Amino acid sequence: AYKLVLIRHGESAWNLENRFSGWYDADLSPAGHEEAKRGGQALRDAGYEFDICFTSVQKRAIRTLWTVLDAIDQMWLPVVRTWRLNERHYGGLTGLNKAETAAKHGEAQVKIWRRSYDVPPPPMEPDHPFYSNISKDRRYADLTEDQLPSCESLKDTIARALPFWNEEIVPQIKEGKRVLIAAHGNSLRGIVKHLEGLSEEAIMELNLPTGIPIVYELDKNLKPIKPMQFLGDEETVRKAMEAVAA
Amino acid sequence: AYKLVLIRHGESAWNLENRFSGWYDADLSPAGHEEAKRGGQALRDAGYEFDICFTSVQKRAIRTLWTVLDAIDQMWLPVVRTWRLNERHYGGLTGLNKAETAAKHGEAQVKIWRRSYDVPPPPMEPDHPFYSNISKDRRYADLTEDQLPSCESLKDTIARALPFWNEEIVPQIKEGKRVLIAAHGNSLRGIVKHLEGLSEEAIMELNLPTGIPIVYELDKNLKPIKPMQFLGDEET
C-alpha cells in the first residue's frame, strides 16, 4: 500500500474574465483561495501527512500548495517546482476570451481544438501580447528549444508531464514517501490517465473537482487499488461532482 | 561582485507573550507578517532577482520567505529548508516568559545564559511541557541522536549552521546563483560571524534588524568588500 494525494487549484483572476490562461501566471481569486483553504482543512481533519510536495512553476498551483501546507501545519515539508506540471500551454489563445477566440479563429477550429486529444491550438508567436511575458520568462531559461512549447495539445501536455512523474515522483513513492501533488487540471489528467489506464476519450471527459483532495491507494506496483477517491464532506463532494459533470 | 541577501523573520506570537520560543514552531504575529511584507516591497522596488532560497524548518522564517517571494513575484524559485538554519534551541527555557524564568532559575543564571557565548541554557528534559512537541516532531526524524539538541549555546547554534553554509550555500554562490536566506537572528549570526571574521564578543554585540533585506557584496573569496547594507525607505 502507498497513498498518493492530488489537488487541482481553484478559480483564478483570469477565470473571472473567461480568458484562456495556460502558461500565463494568473493568481487565485478569493474563491480559488477559499477552495485551497477548504481542501487543506479536509486534509487536516482527516489527519493526512505528507513527506514531499510537487507543484508547477505557476502561482495559482503554488499558492494552493502553500495554503494546504499552512492548514495541515506542514509548511516545513520539502517542496519541488517543475514546469512539467504546468497547465496545458493554450498557445495563441492565451489571453483571449471565448468571443475573441471565435472571431479570430472560427467556430470550426474552436470545435476541433475543444473536442480533440492531439490537435494543438495555434502557436503563440513573437507578436502575441503575452509572448514576452511567457516564452521569455527567465523561469524557462534552462529549457531547450525543443522543450519550450509554443502551444500544446492535451497529448503534448501529458507527454511532458509523465517523464517528471516517472523519474522524480515514482522513486519518492517507492521510497515510501507520502506525496502531495498540487497542480493543474491537464497535467493532473496526465497522471490520472497513466495511473488508471484510461482512454483518450475518458480522460478528456474526466474533469477533476477543484480544491477537493483526490486520494489514490496504490499497490506495490503503483496500480490503483481503487479509482480516485475524494476527501471532504460527502454532501459537498457530491455537489462538486454534480457541478463538474454539469 | 557576488550579491547575497539575508532577512531575519519578524515578531512572532511568542514575542508578544515574552516567551522563549527557540525550536518551538511559533508563527509570525500580524505585525511580523507586515514586516516581511515591507521587506519584500523593498526588494521589489530595488528590482532584486534571486535564483534559489534557503530557510529553516520553522514556520515564522518560512512564512517570511513566502511573503517576500509573493511580493517580488518569484514564488516559482526553488526553496530548500534545513533544520541547520533553525533558531537557537532554548532547552528548558522554552515556553517560559521572563518572570517565570527569573523565579525558576535565578537572576545569576539568567545573567550568565544571556551573556555567554558558550554556556547553554538548561536541557529540555522529558517532563518539560514541550518535550514531545519538539523532540518528537517528525521533521527531525532524520537527525542522529547526537544531532538533536536538548539545548544550544550560541556557539552550538553557529557550529551546526556553518556546515550547511559551507557545504551547500557556498557552492551555489560560486555557481553564480543569486541566493536569498530567510532565517533567524542567531543562525544568521553564524553566517555574519564567519563572513566577517567577528569575535565572540562582537557577534554577541550584533543584533540584526528584523524584516529588513540585508545585502552583502562578496569578492571571489566570498569575503565582503564593505559592511552589510540594508534595503528600505530611509526611516527603516
Ligand SMILES: *S(=O)(=O)c1cccc(S(=O)(=O)Nc2cc(C3=CCCC3)ccc2C(=O)NC)c1
Ligand atoms: S483548459 O482546460 O485549461 C480550458 C480553459 C478555458 C476553457 C476551457 S473549456 O471548458 O474546455 N471550453 C473551451 C475550450 C476551448 C479550447 C480547449 C483547447 C484549446 C481551446 C475552446 C473553446 C471552449 C468553449 O467552451 N468556449 C465557449 C478549457
Ligand SMILES: *S(=O)(=O)c1cccc(S(=O)(=O)Nc2cc(C3=CCCC3)ccc2C(=O)NC)c1
Ligand atoms: S533568542 O535570540 O531567540 C531570545 C529570545 C527571547 C529574548 C531574548 S533577549 O533579548 O536576548 N533577552 C534575554 C535573553 C535570555 C537568554 C538568551 C540565552 C538563554 C537565555 C535571558 C534573559 C533575557 C532578558 O532580557 N530578560 C529580561 C533572546
Ligand SMILES: [Cl-]
Ligand atoms: Cl515553498
